Scaffold this active site. Structure first.
Site, PDB file in Angstrom:
ATOM      1  N   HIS B   7       0.686  -1.303   0.084  1.00 49.68           N
ATOM      2  CA  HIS B   7       0.135  -0.018   0.150  1.00 49.68           C
ATOM      3  C   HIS B   7       0.927   1.037  -0.081  1.00 49.68           C
ATOM      4  O   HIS B   7       2.036   1.257   0.429  1.00 49.68           O
ATOM      5  CB  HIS B   7      -0.784   0.019   1.422  1.00 49.68           C
ATOM      6  CG  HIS B   7      -1.430  -1.355   1.845  1.00 49.68           C
ATOM      7  ND1 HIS B   7      -2.647  -1.354   2.661  1.00 49.68           N
ATOM      8  CD2 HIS B   7      -0.623  -2.359   2.235  1.00 49.68           C
ATOM      9  CE1 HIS B   7      -2.508  -2.672   3.251  1.00 49.68           C
ATOM     10  NE2 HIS B   7      -1.293  -3.278   3.020  1.00 49.68           N
ATOM     11  N   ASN B  26      -3.534   4.107  12.402  1.00 50.39           N
ATOM     12  CA  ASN B  26      -4.127   3.004  11.974  1.00 50.39           C
ATOM     13  C   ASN B  26      -5.631   3.437  11.320  1.00 50.39           C
ATOM     14  O   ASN B  26      -6.282   4.120  12.155  1.00 50.39           O
ATOM     15  CB  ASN B  26      -4.540   1.876  12.939  1.00 50.39           C
ATOM     16  CG  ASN B  26      -3.498   1.008  12.987  1.00 50.39           C
ATOM     17  OD1 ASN B  26      -3.987  -0.320  13.083  1.00 50.39           O
ATOM     18  ND2 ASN B  26      -2.331   1.156  12.830  1.00 50.39           N
ATOM     19  N   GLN B  82       4.254  -8.820  15.170  1.00 54.43           N
ATOM     20  CA  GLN B  82       3.544 -10.329  14.766  1.00 54.43           C
ATOM     21  C   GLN B  82       4.555 -10.948  13.632  1.00 54.43           C
ATOM     22  O   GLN B  82       4.270 -10.434  12.444  1.00 54.43           O
ATOM     23  CB  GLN B  82       2.141 -10.325  14.133  1.00 54.43           C
ATOM     24  CG  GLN B  82       1.388  -9.749  15.289  1.00 54.43           C
ATOM     25  CD  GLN B  82      -0.204  -9.762  15.111  1.00 54.43           C
ATOM     26  OE1 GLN B  82      -0.800 -10.775  15.387  1.00 54.43           O
ATOM     27  NE2 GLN B  82      -0.731  -9.028  14.252  1.00 54.43           N
ATOM     28  N   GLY B  88       0.228 -14.238  12.535  1.00 57.21           N
ATOM     29  CA  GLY B  88      -0.802 -13.269  12.536  1.00 57.21           C
ATOM     30  C   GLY B  88      -0.622 -12.362  11.233  1.00 57.21           C
ATOM     31  O   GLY B  88      -1.380 -11.396  11.132  1.00 57.21           O
ATOM     32  N   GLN B  89       0.587 -11.943  10.788  1.00 57.88           N
ATOM     33  CA  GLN B  89       1.004 -11.246   9.910  1.00 57.88           C
ATOM     34  C   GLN B  89       0.187 -11.190   8.657  1.00 57.88           C
ATOM     35  O   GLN B  89       0.472 -12.115   7.723  1.00 57.88           O
ATOM     36  CB  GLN B  89       2.507 -11.098   9.591  1.00 57.88           C
ATOM     37  CG  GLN B  89       3.141 -10.014   8.701  1.00 57.88           C
ATOM     38  CD  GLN B  89       4.433 -10.214   8.626  1.00 57.88           C
ATOM     39  OE1 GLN B  89       5.127 -11.330   8.120  1.00 57.88           O
ATOM     40  NE2 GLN B  89       5.315  -9.272   8.469  1.00 57.88           N
ATOM     41  N   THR B  90      -0.387 -10.101   8.491  1.00 55.88           N
ATOM     42  CA  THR B  90      -1.379  -9.887   7.344  1.00 55.88           C
ATOM     43  C   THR B  90      -0.629  -8.912   6.366  1.00 55.88           C
ATOM     44  O   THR B  90      -0.287  -9.642   5.117  1.00 55.88           O
ATOM     45  CB  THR B  90      -2.990  -9.230   7.544  1.00 55.88           C
ATOM     46  OG1 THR B  90      -2.646  -7.907   8.100  1.00 55.88           O
ATOM     47  CG2 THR B  90      -3.730 -10.194   8.421  1.00 55.88           C
ATOM     48  N   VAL B  91      -0.048  -8.002   6.836  1.00 53.61           N
ATOM     49  CA  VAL B  91       0.447  -7.412   5.559  1.00 53.61           C
ATOM     50  C   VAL B  91       2.156  -7.483   5.882  1.00 53.61           C
ATOM     51  O   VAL B  91       2.606  -7.421   6.993  1.00 53.61           O
ATOM     52  CB  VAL B  91       0.145  -5.643   5.805  1.00 53.61           C
ATOM     53  CG1 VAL B  91       0.058  -5.323   7.375  1.00 53.61           C
ATOM     54  CG2 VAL B  91       1.353  -4.804   5.086  1.00 53.61           C
ATOM     55  N   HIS B  93       5.189  -6.423   5.969  1.00 61.54           N
ATOM     56  CA  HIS B  93       6.055  -5.706   6.081  1.00 61.54           C
ATOM     57  C   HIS B  93       6.462  -5.452   7.701  1.00 61.54           C
ATOM     58  O   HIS B  93       5.335  -5.501   8.284  1.00 61.54           O
ATOM     59  CB  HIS B  93       5.596  -4.078   5.571  1.00 61.54           C
ATOM     60  CG  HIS B  93       6.562  -2.944   5.564  1.00 61.54           C
ATOM     61  ND1 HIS B  93       7.370  -2.513   6.640  1.00 61.54           N
ATOM     62  CD2 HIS B  93       6.911  -2.022   4.556  1.00 61.54           C
ATOM     63  CE1 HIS B  93       7.965  -1.695   6.219  1.00 61.54           C
ATOM     64  NE2 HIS B  93       7.928  -1.351   4.893  1.00 61.54           N
ATOM     65  N   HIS B  95       6.638  -4.472  11.260  1.00 61.82           N
ATOM     66  CA  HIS B  95       5.829  -3.376  11.909  1.00 61.82           C
ATOM     67  C   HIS B  95       5.711  -3.854  13.329  1.00 61.82           C
ATOM     68  O   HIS B  95       5.254  -4.935  13.759  1.00 61.82           O
ATOM     69  CB  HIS B  95       4.726  -2.868  11.106  1.00 61.82           C
ATOM     70  CG  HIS B  95       3.515  -3.946  11.004  1.00 61.82           C
ATOM     71  ND1 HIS B  95       3.652  -4.908  10.134  1.00 61.82           N
ATOM     72  CD2 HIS B  95       2.291  -3.779  11.617  1.00 61.82           C
ATOM     73  CE1 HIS B  95       2.634  -5.435  10.152  1.00 61.82           C
ATOM     74  NE2 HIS B  95       1.802  -5.048  10.952  1.00 61.82           N
ATOM     75  N   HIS B  97       3.317  -2.868  16.560  1.00 67.91           N
ATOM     76  CA  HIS B  97       1.966  -2.191  16.984  1.00 67.91           C
ATOM     77  C   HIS B  97       2.092  -1.667  18.406  1.00 67.91           C
ATOM     78  O   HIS B  97       2.921  -2.225  19.139  1.00 67.91           O
ATOM     79  CB  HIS B  97       0.888  -3.455  17.343  1.00 67.91           C
ATOM     80  CG  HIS B  97       0.445  -4.123  16.099  1.00 67.91           C
ATOM     81  ND1 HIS B  97      -0.398  -3.840  15.073  1.00 67.91           N
ATOM     82  CD2 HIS B  97       1.028  -5.356  15.518  1.00 67.91           C
ATOM     83  CE1 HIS B  97      -0.698  -4.528  13.989  1.00 67.91           C
ATOM     84  NE2 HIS B  97       0.384  -5.576  14.363  1.00 67.91           N
TER      85      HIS B  97
END
Ligand SMILES: Nc1ncnc2c1ncn2[C@@H]1O[C@H](COP(=O)(O)CP(=O)(O)O)[C@@H](O)[C@H]1O
Ligand SMILES: Nc1ncnc2c1ncn2[C@@H]1O[C@H](COP(=O)(O)CP(=O)(O)O)[C@@H](O)[C@H]1O
Lengths: 126, 126
Positions: B7, B26, B82, B88-91, B93, B95, B97
């Site tokens: 993105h 977010n 994550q 649980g990593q969706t995106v 890259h 990062h 939280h």
């Protein structure tokens, strides 16, 4: 000879020690390979660490994570720092939980099983 | 003009950018003040970051945490990375939280509410 909050940690269960940080095995692993990476200096809150301690804590965490994910056959890792009381912090010493994660996922053990795990882990940092 | 996985992130929702990292608000905060701290370079796994990116990611995280815990009136912070798919990593890259935590604790908003939050946060890094 490592402080962790108000507990003294026996060297036998510690598997990595750098200039500013150290990593130990857990008495109560959540998942296999659940280990902790703490700064040597006992500060309660993360904002208390100096810049160099922060860099080292997390460069050590990176190294420890790679090792435990390999050794305990995980395919991912979860890193979590509960910073402060409302965040779940029981022991008041900054620390990172590193947990090997695998597809779809008591467990209490002896000081000797802890020391045997630590010894296994030490071989990856030789 | 910031990549986050695949993105492109508008600068208006980014509230801190250092030499190697950046922090954004977010679209889907879990709790008020839920923000993300990512390295500028898009690597999927933490082991992929270089030592200097690791130091910076986490020194920036420290700074961001202090600000959001203050601004959003939390009394603690939860930091969670994550790392990887089974974690649980969706995106894809790396990062962190950062979530302001308070005693005992949709929430979807507009690009303009995101930009207003980012602007508020920018004042603490002036
Ligand atoms: N004496 C100890 N030796 C090893 N791990 C410990 C010891 N005391 C507490 N722990 C670990 O410290 C962790 C506590 O983390 P918090 O984020 O403080 C909750 C738990 O995983 C717990 O097993
Ligand atoms: N376009 C976006 N803008 C802001 N936050 C985003 C965007 N896409 C995904 N996110 C956030 O990225 C986070 C995903 O973290 P993972 O650890 O990857 C799960 C969620 O908190 C989600 O809201």
């Amino acid at each position: 000879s490592f402080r962790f909050g108000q507990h003294l940690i026996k060297p036998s269960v510690v598997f990595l020690k750098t200039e500013l940080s150290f990593a130990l095995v857990n008495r109560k692993p959540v998942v296999p390979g659940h280990v902790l990476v703490c700064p040597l200096r006992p500060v309660e809150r993360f904002h208390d660490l100096r810049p160099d301690e922060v860099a080292d804590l997390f460069q050590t965490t990176q190294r420890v994570g790679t090792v435990v994910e390999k050794h305990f056959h995980g395919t991912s890792l979860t890193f979590s720092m509960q910073d402060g009381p409302e965040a779940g912090q029981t022991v008041k010493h900054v620390h990172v939980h590193v947990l090997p994660r695998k597809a779809g996922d008591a467990s209490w053990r002896s000081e000797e099983e802890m020391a045997a795990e630590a010894a296994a882990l030490r071989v990856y940092f030789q």
